[PDB]
Scaffold this active site. Structure first.
Site, PDB file in Angstrom:
ATOM      1  N   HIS A 172       0.800  -1.233   0.000  1.00  0.00           N
ATOM      2  CA  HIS A 172       0.000   0.000   0.000  1.00  0.00           C
ATOM      3  C   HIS A 172       0.824   1.271   0.000  1.00  0.00           C
ATOM      4  CE1 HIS A 172      -2.937  -3.017   1.351  1.00  0.00           C
ATOM      5  NE2 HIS A 172      -3.870  -2.220   0.857  1.00  0.00           N
ATOM      6  N   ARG A 187     -16.825  18.687  23.914  1.00  0.00           N
ATOM      7  CA  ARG A 187     -18.127  18.121  23.631  1.00  0.00           C
ATOM      8  C   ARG A 187     -19.229  18.504  24.614  1.00  0.00           C
ATOM      9  NH1 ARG A 187     -18.756  13.695  20.477  1.00  0.00           N
ATOM     10  NH2 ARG A 187     -20.977  13.964  20.922  1.00  0.00           N
TER      11      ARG A 187
END
Ligand SMILES: Cc1cn(C2C[C@H](O)[C@@H](CO)O2)c(=O)[nH]c1=O
Ligand SMILES: Cc1cn(C2C[C@H](O)[C@@H](CO)O2)c(=O)[nH]c1=O
Ligand SMILES: Cc1cn([C@H]2C[C@H](O)[C@@H](CO)O2)c(=O)[nH]c1=O
Ligand SMILES: Cc1cn([C@H]2C[C@H](O)[C@@H](CO)O2)c(=O)[nH]c1=O
Ligand SMILES: Cc1cn([C@H]2C[C@H](O)[C@@H](CO)O2)c(=O)[nH]c1=O
Ligand SMILES: Cc1cn([C@H]2C[C@H](O)[C@@H](CO)O2)c(=O)[nH]c1=O
Ligand SMILES: [K+]
Ligand SMILES: [K+]
Ligand SMILES: [K+]
EC number: 2.4.2.3
Lengths: 250, 250, 250, 250, 250, 250
Positions: free
Chosen positions: A5, A220
């Site tokens: 890859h 968050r």
């Protein structure tokens, strides 16, 4: 090329054994630049690889793309090419109210909310960072003055439901993850990101040193999606630390 | 008394916030003696508690007995009484051929082969030791010169089948654990013991600092059951380190 | 000594094949006393062993300490020494409103909320008591007039979260166990204790007879923690029954 | 921009409702070119987006990168922007000896060896492709004359151990996956790839149409890693089919 | 007889390779009647078998009884006798408000809420219907004009708790299934029935073609238990379709 | 009719509270005949119901068909009609070499290899028979002189793979069950059947008394499929016992 890859050969690394592994391929050169003799090696799919020099020693910077799977590829193939220490540098959302945008997080171990870690070790195996690496990161962060938090990270296979984001196309979160963020919060988990579980597990279970550091770009308890404005100023902070940590690990 | 099992009151601790937690109740005084003003506080079931002084500060030594469950009791109740840092000192069997009897092991995180950890956090949560504690242990061990290994530990609810011992009454190991030791070995797990998984998980998920150190008294690549002869010489080694690590954490 | 933990030899048992196994080591002599020729054999860690005589036959009393793990040690090593029948005598908290403090509970099988049972058989294997033992217990209880309940027990690796106690240091219960007591109640589970799951599973799966009886010292529909006042008066009740049941099983 | 990752606005799509989603960002333009009025829209991280026209209707081509996580991002955000049909075009390794390199595989449903699917639906939910999409793919493949196989696909979070590749750095495969390929083979699974499980599950469970097609570039009964030589000739085959299937779905 | 349960011989089938498999044994003749030369073959336990002729070719009709287990028997033994294609015709309760009593449902794949499917393939394997069979059913349904829905079915080992029916003896549903219907609804699951999960999984994993069609006799957004009045008028509808689909599959 | 499947009304039972529940509907009359005033009540699907009289009290005999699901139906609906005690009478294959064809097996608890039990209680809940019922069965068997074995049964959702039968169409057994029979054998499991797990679990968790008895018609250490010759002579043995046991439970 020696690996399927990355499009790299053992010779390209020039005896490099440490790799900084950012997620975004555009951050690769950005990081390489902080070092000496930065050279582009390859770019295929989400995998961009640069070589640079740190205190006269070869160092690889290589992107993983988002998530466990592609991380598991970059790590595996870099290992085949001789890399033994992996330092991840990321961006994250904090889930504790005392962690601020800009703060640097060093991860000791991860909540395994991923799939790939399982392909390396059963769930009961701890997704724990290497002690030397964590020490290097914690110290590097001290020496550049960054305000730092050290702890456990929730590492999720998704950006949306697994991090209990509701402002989504469907606006529902599978039962399994409903109220999950509150539970992680109660257990003192600092933050969500998406790669550390796979990275840490596959390294811990194959004798490879891994460390994990990230910059906080959203809290968050306040928003679901970050604001663009100071995203880059925080990136530059954690990058400085990971390069320094690398120096200490050579 | 303020707690159901330990038979202690918040007043007994005298503002102590750190506890050394050995497994064997007979090792309790042994450890307390290494410190100043050792006083027996209570002894009920497997739980023996002493107080002592370290650099002028109150310290608790308290036994957990064998296994997660009773550990989970001692830790819970000591927390109620105000303890915030827990240092475990144990005995272990090494499963790697390079770790020798007498070597000291510092645990970064544990393979969760127990039941009690699950009662505190789901299996995906890392049974990871506190970073300050680990650092304190690793350093303590360096300063006393001990030959030390830092890494992952397999923490099992049994002494026999879960640690793949076959020299047993039935001489069989449930399918689940067959060939398990070889797998842990390949993933570089250092050793088996029986409490770290519960201890670390319950602490990491409740904002309590925990550290784990043990003395090696048998190498599993050689025997299943330890020899009695140098078992005590190794105990005295790790005890020295845990007390010193405690000093650093006050 | 013939076994690693108990410090006993096959000769110490004198051909004994039945063991009464209490949890608290201080209850050991207490039980042995109810029999003829009580003699202390050994005391190591949480494991205290006495021998006595019942109708001219040798009987062992041996403590397990709290929880599966150490139980799994005592049982294994007693089996190695020749014990084939294990009778557990315990203390428990009832979760049904009709079961009263003082009542005696005979367990037919257990809800496996432990870890150790898994090291002996997969979860689908029933933690079921031996039919002869249960019959002996049920009958012994009838003959001494005790008010008795026979049924399923929830056997938990913790005293706190796994039994959904909230009056704890953190005051939260992991999601898995939230509302679990109500569910066990609805399924008619009588009570919580900490060893029967391990004990019954490991025996049932290795051809060893096991029975389980306990005294109720708290009803959970009323309190979380027992009162000290009539704790001992209930202990003396169930002990009488287990010894009598043992007589019937010789 | 309207979405966090893709850097697109609802306006960029121009009322497009279908997206072809290749994995490699370099294949994006390659596919867009097969259509009318190809325009590059954005490129961020592994996400490259082009718009084109099919029979006078807007169509999106957007890369997912390798694996569930990033796929789950691309799909979510494209859904936010109005995409309702997703056609995946991929590369795969066949595991049946009768499937040849060059053959085109249409997936009916997937073996969920991923993590992200779980964030959308529990494991018991079928990772099943949309019936209209499958039919479109199957027919498209018939009309261009390609030799085609229709069936189940094993979709794995890793390229290496989860696909039981052994020619790797460590050369071991976690117990879970040992002999897994033979099992999938026996159950008639055609092939391994890495995204369909996430793609199909998240779509099936959120009222979004998905289809999955791939070109075979290696047969696993023969090699582990593909040869470069005819990799591109097979890519061009499946691409033709997916574009045609898209035509049928407008 | 050649098989243990069905009481059939390979000779009885006369080279038949397709079987229509209703659940109720009384529907068997009813179905056989729609074809030529209907002959009763055998009747044992819940398994009633008829042979008939379709376009001059032998066809088997055989009942499965309620549930996975007995279905898994019928299918196995029919396969031993040479059946290769199985078409299930059932009755079902819709859980979407837009699906009406009388509507015909074709199942693409099933949510595996059964036990038997696991005996054939792990949970991650998709309980997916054969593409040719599904196509045959969808088209058959079109040609007889029935109003049809194609999608995923929830396939449950119970009629009561697993389908979240509360109007039952105990009136409780085990935690696992509480609110489960709402979740299936949200994921677009059409309906509950009890055999498709086993049927489809065992066939998909053993190279046998299976299809699944059912008539809606109750909508669960309105009632728990069907009314008797139009139950038979809907049965006659789906039967017509399955026989026609069979014609197309010969 | 008062129930959806059985086609019975509370009035038909005439205040009956005990039911004998055979699997094969043809065994129903056979059993009812052993009692006074046998009357056929209903026959629908696999569910045949007779009423008879035992010591002047109404008793129901009702078939379950093969497997958990349909059993779970019969039991539920009988419970709605007022049945409180269920005695199962079955046929089984022994897996221990010392258990002979003709022997009678009384089940104390079952290995849960089914799906339906989970719809009533989580896997950790013991599929345990009621103590009074088991006692009645054991005693009944003693009084008619039958050679009897009391113990754990493996209760499987399949007849073939889950009981590791290999002489099947595919001749493979899913990995999960490979070597499973050897494991059950080692744990002393007596036998395989298909309903006890569901029956016992659903009853134990809903305050309903259940007992389980079966006749051995094949020993699996010798054959996979029984011989027809003495199958009926063994059936008549266990039937006698279950009726007697019922007498004792009225
Ligand atoms: C009407 C209906 C039927 N069924 C099914 C499938 C079984 O074959 C049979 C049992 O009644 O009918 C359901 O599962 N749910 C329902 O709502
Ligand atoms: C002979 C035999 C019967 N059975 C069972 C229980 C089923 O309800 C019934 C159908 O054969 O018989 C087994 O499960 N295994 C065996 O070996
Ligand atoms: C800001 C943020 C980032 N991330 C991560 C790790 C991913 O690879 C990457 C993509 O946003 O950043 C999260 O997982 N959650 C968040 O809230
Ligand atoms: C020697 C040894 C000890 N131990 C541990 C921790 C337990 O509390 C105790 C049991 O001997 O000692 C192991 O778990 N494995 C071994 O090999
Ligand atoms: C009173 C009570 C005791 N116990 C048990 C079993 C343990 O061995 C011991 C710990 O006190 O007592 C419970 O588990 N739950 C309770 O409510
Ligand atoms: C050749 C091949 C490709 N792939 C896939 C899907 C991934 O996105 C991509 C990278 O190899 O191709 C496999 O998963 N397994 C294989 O054997
Ligand atoms: K203990
Ligand atoms: K990726
Ligand atoms: K049935």
């Amino acid at each position: 090329s020696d690996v399927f890859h990355l499009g790299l050969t053992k010779n390209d690394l020039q005896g490099a054994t440490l790799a900084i592994v950012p997620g975004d391929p555009d951050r690769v050169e950005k990081i390489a630049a902080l070092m000496d003799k930065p050279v582009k090696l390859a770019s295929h799919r989400e995998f961009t690889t640069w070589r640079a020099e740190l205190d006269g020693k070869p160092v690889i910077v290589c992107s993983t793309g988002i998530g466990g799977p592609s991380t598991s590829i970059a790590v595996e193939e870099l290992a085949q090419l001789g890399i033994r220490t992996f330092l991840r540098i990321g961006t994250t959302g904090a889930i504790q109210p005392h962690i601020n945008v800009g703060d640097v997080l060093v991860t000791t171990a991860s909540v395994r909310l991923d799939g790939a870690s399982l392909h390396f070790a059963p769930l009961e195996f701890p997704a724990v960072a290497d002690f030397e690496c964590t020490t290097a990161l914690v110290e590097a962060a001290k020496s550049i003055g960054a305000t730092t938090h050290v702890g456990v990270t929730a590492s999720s296979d998704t950006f949306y439901p697994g991090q209990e984001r509701y402002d989504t196309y469907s606006g529902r979160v599978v039962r399994h993850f409903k109220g999950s963020m509150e539970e992680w919060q109660a257990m003192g988990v600092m933050n969500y990101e998406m790669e550390s579980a796979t990275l840490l597990t596959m390294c811990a279970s194959q004798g490879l040193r891994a460390g994990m550091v990230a910059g906080v770009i959203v809290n968050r308890t306040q928003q679901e999606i970050p604001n663009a404005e100071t995203m880059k100023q925080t990136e530059s902070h954690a990058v400085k630390i990971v390069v320094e940590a690398a120096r200490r690990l050579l």
